[PDB]
Motif scaffolding. Structure first.
Motif, PDB file in Angstrom:
ATOM      1  N   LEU A  25       0.927  -1.230  -0.209  1.00 47.83           N
ATOM      2  CA  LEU A  25       0.186  -0.022  -0.063  1.00 47.83           C
ATOM      3  C   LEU A  25       0.819   1.252  -0.050  1.00 47.83           C
ATOM      4  O   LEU A  25       0.453   2.254  -0.620  1.00 47.83           O
ATOM      5  CB  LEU A  25      -1.022  -0.074   1.272  1.00 47.83           C
ATOM      6  CG  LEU A  25      -2.184  -0.999   1.232  1.00 47.83           C
ATOM      7  CD1 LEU A  25      -3.108  -0.844   2.465  1.00 47.83           C
ATOM      8  CD2 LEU A  25      -2.847  -0.516  -0.189  1.00 47.83           C
TER       9      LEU A  25
ATOM     10  N   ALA B 169       1.010   3.884  -2.993  1.00 47.34           N
ATOM     11  CA  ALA B 169       1.018   5.297  -2.859  1.00 47.34           C
ATOM     12  C   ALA B 169       2.078   6.084  -3.390  1.00 47.34           C
ATOM     13  O   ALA B 169       1.783   7.135  -3.985  1.00 47.34           O
ATOM     14  CB  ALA B 169       0.764   5.440  -1.332  1.00 47.34           C
TER      15      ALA B 169
ATOM     16  N   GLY C  99       2.481  -4.786 -10.390  1.00 45.32           N
ATOM     17  CA  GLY C  99       1.735  -3.811  -9.702  1.00 45.32           C
ATOM     18  C   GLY C  99       0.446  -4.366  -9.069  1.00 45.32           C
ATOM     19  O   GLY C  99      -0.341  -3.541  -8.813  1.00 45.32           O
TER      20      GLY C  99
ATOM     21  N   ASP D 107       3.784   5.169  -5.931  1.00 45.22           N
ATOM     22  CA  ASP D 107       3.634   5.506  -7.439  1.00 45.22           C
ATOM     23  C   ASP D 107       2.536   6.460  -7.800  1.00 45.22           C
ATOM     24  O   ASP D 107       2.880   7.335  -8.865  1.00 45.22           O
ATOM     25  CB  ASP D 107       3.216   4.103  -8.053  1.00 45.22           C
ATOM     26  CG  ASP D 107       4.434   3.084  -8.050  1.00 45.22           C
ATOM     27  OD1 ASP D 107       5.446   3.408  -7.492  1.00 45.22           O
ATOM     28  OD2 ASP D 107       4.007   1.948  -8.657  1.00 45.22           O
ATOM     29  N   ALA D 108       1.456   6.505  -7.056  1.00 46.52           N
ATOM     30  CA  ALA D 108       0.782   7.617  -7.354  1.00 46.52           C
ATOM     31  C   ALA D 108       1.150   9.103  -7.116  1.00 46.52           C
ATOM     32  O   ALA D 108       0.899   9.882  -8.081  1.00 46.52           O
ATOM     33  CB  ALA D 108      -0.961   7.471  -6.296  1.00 46.52           C
TER      34      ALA D 108
ATOM     35  N   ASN E  90      -9.006   0.096 -13.228  1.00 40.10           N
ATOM     36  CA  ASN E  90      -7.940  -0.073 -12.762  1.00 40.10           C
ATOM     37  C   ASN E  90      -7.908  -1.126 -11.548  1.00 40.10           C
ATOM     38  O   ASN E  90      -7.023  -2.000 -11.522  1.00 40.10           O
ATOM     39  CB  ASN E  90      -7.027   1.098 -12.262  1.00 40.10           C
ATOM     40  CG  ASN E  90      -6.588   1.716 -13.346  1.00 40.10           C
ATOM     41  OD1 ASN E  90      -6.460   1.354 -14.338  1.00 40.10           O
ATOM     42  ND2 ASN E  90      -6.053   3.110 -13.016  1.00 40.10           N
ATOM     43  N   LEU E  91      -9.292  -1.118 -10.714  1.00 37.77           N
ATOM     44  CA  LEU E  91      -9.117  -2.038  -9.745  1.00 37.77           C
ATOM     45  C   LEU E  91      -9.930  -3.251  -9.960  1.00 37.77           C
ATOM     46  O   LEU E  91      -9.983  -4.434  -8.832  1.00 37.77           O
ATOM     47  CB  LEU E  91      -9.984  -1.160  -8.590  1.00 37.77           C
ATOM     48  CG  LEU E  91      -9.017  -0.111  -7.710  1.00 37.77           C
ATOM     49  CD1 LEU E  91      -9.712   0.397  -6.644  1.00 37.77           C
ATOM     50  CD2 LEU E  91      -7.646  -0.532  -7.719  1.00 37.77           C
TER      51      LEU E  91
ATOM     52  N   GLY F  25      -4.829  10.328  -7.637  1.00 38.32           N
ATOM     53  CA  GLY F  25      -6.260  10.182  -7.574  1.00 38.32           C
ATOM     54  C   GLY F  25      -6.367   9.163  -8.702  1.00 38.32           C
ATOM     55  O   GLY F  25      -5.992   8.852  -9.985  1.00 38.32           O
TER      56      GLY F  25
ATOM     57  N   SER G 279     -11.308   8.017  -3.587  1.00 35.09           N
ATOM     58  CA  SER G 279     -10.198   8.775  -4.234  1.00 35.09           C
ATOM     59  C   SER G 279     -10.932   9.866  -5.051  1.00 35.09           C
ATOM     60  O   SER G 279     -11.976   9.829  -5.330  1.00 35.09           O
ATOM     61  CB  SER G 279      -9.800   7.737  -5.490  1.00 35.09           C
ATOM     62  OG  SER G 279      -8.752   8.182  -6.333  1.00 35.09           O
TER      63      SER G 279
ATOM     64  N   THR H 204      -6.139   9.476  -2.675  1.00 36.53           N
ATOM     65  CA  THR H 204      -6.528   8.269  -2.385  1.00 36.53           C
ATOM     66  C   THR H 204      -6.317   7.749  -0.985  1.00 36.53           C
ATOM     67  O   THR H 204      -5.481   8.013  -0.431  1.00 36.53           O
ATOM     68  CB  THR H 204      -5.993   7.082  -3.417  1.00 36.53           C
ATOM     69  OG1 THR H 204      -6.635   7.289  -4.433  1.00 36.53           O
ATOM     70  CG2 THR H 204      -6.815   5.648  -2.997  1.00 36.53           C
TER      71      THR H 204
ATOM     72  N   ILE I 101      -6.987   4.267   0.950  1.00 35.71           N
ATOM     73  CA  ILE I 101      -7.304   2.872   1.305  1.00 35.71           C
ATOM     74  C   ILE I 101      -7.688   2.670   2.802  1.00 35.71           C
ATOM     75  O   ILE I 101      -7.071   3.052   3.562  1.00 35.71           O
ATOM     76  CB  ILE I 101      -6.157   1.895   0.871  1.00 35.71           C
ATOM     77  CG1 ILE I 101      -5.697   2.213  -0.595  1.00 35.71           C
ATOM     78  CG2 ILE I 101      -6.476   0.413   0.779  1.00 35.71           C
ATOM     79  CD1 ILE I 101      -6.596   2.088  -1.785  1.00 35.71           C
TER      80      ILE I 101
END
Ligand SMILES: COC(=O)c1c(O)cc(O)c(Cl)c1CCc1ccccc1Cc1ccccc1
Length: 214
Positions: A31, A35, A115, A37-38, A89-90, A80, A132, A164, A166
């Motif tokens: 996680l 994060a 990923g 990467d985002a 994506n999810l 986001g 998000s 975002t 989680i």
């Protein structure tokens, strides 16, 4: 508003749960990694766009233990996800094939390379909530117990600015992850090669505040 995961995501979720049932702490490695990467992705968008950071000027990761409500929050202020990014994506991969056979054939190493480390959250969580806010869309919420998911407009409006959260409704075997001592040890462990400040909402002798870990 409700959707089904695709077959390969079901397969990989099962593959993940039966491979890493022993190394459960990796969920928090993945996680924090996701994060970063985002945040990376918004830092680069901001190179060619001065509006990129308008929604929220900082690039952080704030982690929160709420042990009365049995919850763990990992909030970043990265790029986001629009509502459709939540859905594909999810709930999808596509962008795998042999991975399902190359993971069956240490897979703790190899989960992060594709990923796909997000699903490692079901190792410790009965529900995952992804809140998000993306600059090109309204704040949305994604919710799943792995048997399906739904995305809905967030009735609380735009609380994130951009980014975002989680949220993990922890299992009972994962109640350990509600004590700050454990959480800050696991965050310190997995945050060192991360280029953003990572905080935990902690207690000092008594008031609460963000405590920096890297
Ligand atoms: C945009 O990312 C988030 O909001 C986010 C986030 O900020 C934190 C997270 O823990 C997760 Cl899981 C996500 C979802 C991201 C995701 C999950 C599964 C498959 C693809 C992607 C897209 C992606 C691409 C480049 C860099 C980061 C993320």
């Amino acid at each position: 508003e409700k959707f089904a995961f695709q077959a390969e995501v079901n397969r990989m979720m099962k593959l993940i749960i039966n491979s890493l049932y022993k190394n459960k702490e990796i969920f928090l490695r993945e996680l924090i990694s996701n994060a970063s990467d985002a945040l990376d992705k918004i830092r680069l968008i901001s190179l060619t766009d001065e509006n990129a950071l308008a929604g929220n000027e900082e690039l952080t990761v704030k982690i929160k233990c709420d042990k009365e409500k049995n919850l763990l929050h990992v909030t970043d202020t990265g790029v986001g996800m629009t509502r459709e990014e939540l859905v594909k994506n999810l709930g999808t991969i596509a962008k795998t094939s042999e991975f399902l056979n190359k993971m069956t054939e240490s897979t703790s190493e190899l989960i992060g390379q594709f990923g796909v480390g997000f699903y490692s959250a079901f190792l410790v969580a009965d529900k995952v909530i992804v809140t998000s806010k993306h600059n090109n869309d309204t704040q949305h919420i994604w919710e799943s117990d792995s048997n399906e998911f739904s995305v809905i407009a967030d009735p609380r409006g735009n609380t994130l600015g951009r980014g975002t959260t989680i949220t993990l409704v922890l299992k009972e075997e994962a109640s350990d992850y509600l004590e700050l001592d454990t959480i800050k040890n696991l965050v310190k462990k997995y945050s060192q090669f991360i280029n953003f400040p990572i905080y935990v909402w902690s207690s000092k002798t008594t008031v609460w505040d963000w405590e920096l870990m890297n």
